[PDB]
């Protein structure tokens, strides 16, 4: 028996106010008029009476979209505050125009009429409001130590965050950008960048800021989509405040703008400069032409040096031929790196400091060219973006290992004279370190070729997904390294008392890299190595067996080894499978825009004159007219976009409501004509 | 394709072999890189078949010898290490060059990590996604293939079996 | 310049027919009347004129849902054939009632008005048609060799298939089952079973028949869902043409009907007969009570034998206690099987024929009980469903191995007298075969426990998914066995010339089960074994090396081995991963209905009196009233279901169309009143 | 015959709640305007 | 004989080919000597 009563009692109005509110809601030109006259004379009705469910007389008159009752209430001095916002949110032009011609609320007090109009994204209401000289407060910069931001955040943090989000939502509407900004493309780019960088700062309101940034990027892409000619697209892309706006969009990570089909057409025509209709030809003749131009890599580079402006000197200046020549030079470098480890060119293996062979003497200009190119990349173009590549770390590692190999070879040549057999050299002979670093640099140089996958149409998205899933490999190795450190600590602590010597063990071998694996858990480094190698099954089971008859210690060690194997394989590897499968499933939707953005960024790196020579040969010693043309193009694009959007806003629901309103008005007019 | 249960299975097999073909390019690039590095590091300590026991020089012996001495043998060793058939002591040289052995073992471990933990599970994710996409349109493809097999037996040409067609 | 003309010219009517058709379409009581009078007198208008887009005057009058023009056209002798079907498909009651009161077509000639009414699933139209004494032709049985089916299929197969599908779609409508059938539950069960079995026969029209079977099953479940009392549910489930209708639904594989919550309540109350509120108690006290009743398994079975109708004799007759006693007896059997291979009970290991030990003497009554229970299961209950279990094959294998072990032990006892050490026994000694078959039967008996997973709430759907994915394991092993046979044939053909002898090989071992693996590909059986064991990495690499210096043969063999390893692991295992992941993703939706059906089928196996004793102790020596009650229950359920369905058929579209029709009729009536 | 059957099936499968609703409002507005003109 | 089916196979019209009535006609042309091959039991079919 649960008793049910209204615990929050609302002060109900008198019966005289109910008649006035019912006359307002039903709609009557005479009953409301005489009710207001009686309220003026006898004071029977409070004019500012309000329903318990937040509905004043003016709000109900707005909800009925009738202008006569609204005009009479406006002339009868009804409380008009917080009533234009309801008409704006209802999105009716007549009521907003009438209220602009002159307690409880459903809107937060920081909302202005222009802000709500921008939130509702109605073109006519926003235009009619901005004609009345309205302004929006400027949101502050993200990192503020000023008093006006810090004190406001300290006093009322929720109101501050709500006000900032409301302002940024008002500024990000496509209609307000199309009306109030003279450069909607650059405004959309900038607002998308600020909203994306601000979503990470305000990590709790991340979804709304990400949605607003996506809205701005979509508006920029849709504004570019309305181009009806190649001249308009060339004017858009070449506008400088060669392809300036495309470089700006690449800077602001506008992947949807970059991967637009007409932008990709213009980039493809600029890429195949010397080949009219490269996509037209057969794949066999394309492969033959690519092979010929690649095999002509000593050519077209000497000709550039001896005659830059000849018939043949301008052949390498085209971007595709430049890319082919660079790829051919790198493949030739890797071929000589393969040839450097062969018996035909490498002899006299028992000298402490050897002079370089012919293959290494040929390798040296390539290494100097790579070093000089990476040095020039630090200066030319800039330094703040050189580290913002994530491929230049690999190049820096390659060049550092090359320099270390060269320096160690020089030291071993100048301080070691004579010959000595290789078995009696010391552990840290400079020659051995040089041969190790050269091999590591060979691995890095041959793995550098993955960056060329974005040019191909089939290996590009594959490399994009490879990066996507390496981002989760990086997360998985933290848990794996914690588990590895835990079990290594435990196993070394259990097993370090039974450490033997290399002399006692057979073949003078102490470690897990022997025929009979010895001292697998004796030291912490060897324990880490053993627990790493047990993942691939290369650690045998008898390494947990000690010389003495300590069967309890052996059993506890084998149990630790089995628990580590279970945790590190059965749980963790299949967890990694599930993680990468989920990440691949998410990225497979947006996998072609990313590849097209990466391919575009690779294409614009070959457009400029800098770095024309391959690394073998790169070490051998009025604005008003453009602004007005862009302004006409923007005017046409904005008009086309606003027309397409304004009738794409026509909806079955709104059309149906409009038809009922027109039918009701016409029936009432016909009834008044008959009566 | 004639059978009702093994037809779409072979269709999906072709669907995922189309992604096997894409995966082997990255795997072959990684294999060539690590083979080049390991052969360059390890070719100085090449022995002869006479000095090695049982006159065997290679990884197909009881005691695996000269795993990274030549480029062909380095490619074979790095291929066979995927299935765990390459032992760990092949990175150990006769001399006491512990730095060279450590760098070789580190290259071998990095290759094992890249070629198994990253690449095989990447291939798992790729083929799982491709199977999920093709599982919708998997019965129309089989019926088209079965029809194409059926019309190859309708004509009079090739009526005799290959024992009796000559 | 592609010329565009109408290649299929349609004979357009004269301008006099256009006026008549426009007057019919617009709606005019006077223009159509005078047009028909002029057509009667001057023969200016053909009354049966037809639009090019398949629209006669009567069809347009049907589309306008106006009965006056339809009545005048009916009185004016307009061609009425193939016009009731349009009114039925449009689903208007008045036009259908009026046309029932008296070239090109959009309907196939095999469609009758009752069949189209059943296809549209409108209750009022179906009722109004079935009141007019209409019949539906009976579809034939699935396997017909009769002339009337075979000749019709030979002359016109497409028409025959379309007619059969149309008839079965008409019979499967819920409204026709609710009206024309006196037992809608049994009719829905039978029709669902025939449609499910007919979908596999007509394998091309499989989707439609499967959809119709699912529709029938959904109708049966929804008819059961309208029960408002436990008495009605007990009347439904106990109706015999104890739980008879539940057994019928289990026979017809009605998983949705069985897994209904009220049926599961009734089954759960019948299952926990001696425990009022078993789900109420704590899990600890539940485990303690289950352990006590299980450990009392010698008890409650002797008491059943000495006093079946005592206080304690009826305790095991309850289903849950019977299940607990059976599980305890099986676990005790497995415990003695574990004890049989211990040194405490097994001694004198060098006798050719041993007498049985005490553990085997205790095992023998359990084996005899299992054999007698499986023999009784063949006779009691029936034989045609004993093979339709897929668990009785396992039981038959266990009992056959038990009988073989007993017979071999008897033979080895009666023909082998004396002692002999185990190393000089022959390869096929009967004792060794007995010990092998006993171990295989032990494996099978301990793996038999998987069938008890459906009782638990967490391991039931897991076993359902295990069966789901074993169904794809079975598909995968065909490709794997084909690949295995191919590579085994090739490797044996290459390697059989270098076969050695066991004497020449060390330790007199010839095979891959030695310390040094020898002759891995010498014979076809050993090649199959080697290629099987190479999947788990247990085959070493030196087995491809021959004694002679045939490096080309060794290289080709190693290349075959590597290709087999790649195909059988990298492609096939990850393909199997993808297949089972997809199958698990599909079955994870319908994974709880399957488990509840399996748990119900396990529960009804303990309800009956047969097999009350555990296998240790099972070898010790008026219908009119029920029909009328069921009829009242069916009347109430059908009325509730038809009311719920008939206003669930109310839709925004139909209500909106009805409101426009009423508004148009009222406005026309008001205009006629004014005029 | 096939083209006639296909065009009939497609042409009334093109009937949609939105288009039918718009057609009904247009017919209602036209009939109300005609009745008003008849009265006036 | 089936000319338009061969044309549709040439143009890779998989939806046209896998239509149920086309598959019926192909199945009746395939089981020429077995009226009702799908009718029989799987054991007698295997035999
Ligand atoms: C990423 C960016 C950085 C890349 C690396 C830049 C630096 C590169 C190369 C410089 C290496 C150090 C100087 C070697 C010569 C000097 C010397 O006497 O060394 C002493 C110490 O030697 C060592 O401890 C060996 C260090 C090897 C580092 C290899 C890194 C490989 C990274 C792979 C990454 C994949 C010799 O021994 P001792 O003390 O005489 O006894
Ligand atoms: C599934 C349903 C069927 C289940 C099995 C029913 C039959 C069970 C058992 C009967 C086995 C045959 C009779 C053995 C004794 C007779 C004899 O002389 O055998 C001779 C042949 O022996 C063989 O060839 C061994 C056959 C072993 C079969 C094991 C099947 C295990 C199935 C596991 C499935 C998981 C002895 O050798 P010789 O010829 O003297 O030389
Ligand atoms: C004693 C020690 C002995 C050691 C012996 C073994 C040596 C092993 C050497 C090899 C080590 C691993 C090398 C991995 C190379 C590939 C890296 C991933 C490539 C890839 O697909 O992702 C790219 C990132 O790569 C990158 O970010 C490149 C990372 C390069 C790291 C180099 C470290 C040195 C994406 O491309 P993107 O970066 O343009 O994506 C957009 C901007 N984020
Ligand atoms: C010289 C030879 C030496 C051999 C030595 C090795 C011997 C190995 C013995 C063990 C072999 C494998 C046994 C597998 C047991 C489990 C089977 C699957 C169980 C499962 O989850 O699925 C059930 C089916 O099981 C079933 O259908 C049971 C299949 C039993 C097959 C027994 C063959 C003998 C589903 O349950 P459900 O069938 O009720 O599902 C609804 C009606 N379909
Ligand atoms: C960190 C991330 C969270 C991990 C949470 C835990 C995960 C599960 C851990 C399971 C540990 C099992 C240890 C078994 C062990 O040491 O055996 C070796 C030792 C070797 O002596 O085994 C024994 O001593 C007992 C012999 C029977 C082993 C039965 C194992 C049952 C579980 C199998 C799991 C699947 C494989
Ligand atoms: C190409 C495609 C992109 C690949 C990008 C990179 C992927 C990750 C690479 C990780 C390399 C780890 C190398 C470890 C190594 O050489 O160990 C052998 C060597 C053998 O001496 O190990 C050591 O010297 C250190 C012993 C501890 C090893 C800890 C390993 C932590 C990472 C584990 C990952 C999961 C397994
Ligand atoms: C049946 C189902 C469809 C199968 C379709 C085909 C699938 C791919 C087959 C690939 C065969 C590769 C054979 C390699 C081989 O024999 O190596 C052993 C032999 C051993 O001598 O290797 C060589 O002789 C060459 C050494 C380099 C091997 C490079 C392998 C590249 C491909 C790797 C794939 C991933 C692992
Ligand atoms: C499988 C083994 C033998 C690979 C050995 C390494 C190289 C010989 C391969 C690996 C990556 C390959 C590259 C991958 C992608 C491309 C881009 C591709 O670009 C185009 O097709 C041009 C048109 C466009 O830009 O879209 C031209 C070949 C090239 C350089 C490939 C050239 C050959 C490379 C360097
Ligand atoms: C698992 C191991 C024992 C397989 C060994 C190889 C062969 C004995 C198998 C492998 C593939 C099998 C074939 C796979 C598919 C078919 C089609 C199948 O076609 C039908 O059922 C006829 C009706 C139709 O065409 O749909 C008849 C059996 C056949 C030839 C099978 C015959 C037996 C084959 C050749
Ligand atoms: C992990 C190892 C130690 C398992 C060794 C084998 C047995 C000791 C296990 C395996 C399967 C188990 C059974 C799995 C499921 C059930 C059903 C379960 O049923 C209930 O909870 C009763 C209520 C209901 O029917 O829903 C009772 C325990 C039981 C028989 C379990 C008893 C113990 C069993 C036989
Ligand atoms: Ca660089
Ligand atoms: Ca049984
Ligand atoms: Zn500030
Ligand atoms: Zn028949």
Author numbering:
A (entry chain C), C (entry chain A): 17 to 118, 135 to 273, 286 to 665, 705 to 758
B (entry chain D): 498 to 663
D (entry chain D): 719 to 758
E (entry chain D): 286 to 332
Sentences from the study reporting this entry:
Like many other TRP channels, TRPC5 is permeable to Ca2+, with little selectivity among monovalent cations, and functions as a thermosensing channel. Here, we present structures of the human TRPC5-Gαi3 protein complexes using cryo-electron microscopy (cryo-EM) and demonstrate that Gαi3 can directly activate TRPC5, increasing its sensitivity to phosphatidylinositol 4,5-bisphosphate (PIP2) using electrophysiology. Remarkably, Gαi3 binds to the ankyrin repeat edge of TRPC5 ~ 50 Å away from the cell membrane. Electrophysiological analysis shows that Gαi3 increases the sensitivity of TRPC5 to phosphatidylinositol 4,5-bisphosphate (PIP2), thereby rendering TRPC5 more easily opened in the cell membrane, where the concentration of PIP2 is physiologically regulated.
